Structure 1
Amino acid sequence: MPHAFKPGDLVFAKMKGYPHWPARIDDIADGAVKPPPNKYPIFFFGTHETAFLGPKDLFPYDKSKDKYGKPNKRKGFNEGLWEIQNNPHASYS
């Protein structure tokens, strides 16, 4: 059975106006800004942007990749697909 989301989990993350996007739940570094309550720090592959999202917008990658893991015209997306499949836990700093 599913657990709660934890750092390192791979997802497609949904935001208004963008296709479901390859992403990971990030850790919060010591000294770094914490997310709001009930929000997770989401690192978007390809763009390498962070946003804070709740579980309603987080689709587990394994379950969802046949639907959402297809090329997209959007800037950074196809790079993002490579990252999530090929090195999802690397440093992209």
Structure 2
Amino acid sequence: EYKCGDLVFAKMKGYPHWPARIDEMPEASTANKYQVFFFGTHETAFLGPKDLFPYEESKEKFGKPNKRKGFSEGLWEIENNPTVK
């Protein structure tokens, strides 16, 4: 489904649909799991496509600000979207 670099909203228990990219393509009958880099907080994690959702295609469904540590900063980082930290 997804390539590397691809922007999405990753969902995990605890937190809302958080803005993120893929930053390692998986291989390739896989780990079953894309490595993900969460914007603003710069966390990483693995997740199923279950928990994925492309960014532009569900931009305004999930793109509401949020009052969470580093969310509206993640939202800002697109904008600069291959940020490093």
TM-score normalised by the chain length of structure 1: 0.82
Q: Structure 1: which 4+ aligned runs deviate by more than 6 Å?
A: none
Q: In structure 2, how many angstroms separate the alpha carbons of the residues matched to 1:81 and 1:24?
A: 12
Partner of 1:68: 62
Q: In structure 1, how many angstroms separate the alpha carbons of the residues matched to 2:61 and 2:7?
A: 15
Greater helix content: 1
Q: Aligned residues, how many?
A: 82
Q: CA deviation at 1:7?
A: 0.6
What is the SS of the residue equivalent to 1:61? coil
**What are the within-5 Å matches in structure 2 for residues 1-93 of structure 1?**
4-27=1-24, 37-83=31-77, 85-90=78-83, 92-93=84-85
TM-score normalised by the chain length of structure 2: 0.89
Larger Rg: 1
Q: 1:10-54: per-residue Cα shift (whole Å, max 9, x none)?
A: 0000001211000000127xxxxx9x8111101000000001001
Q: In structure 2, how many angstroms separate the alpha carbons of the residues matched to 1:87 and 1:13?
A: 18
CA RMSD of superposed structures (Å): 1.6
Q: Which runs of 5+ in 2 are unaligned?
A: none
Q: Which runs of 5+ in 1 are unaligned?
A: 29-33
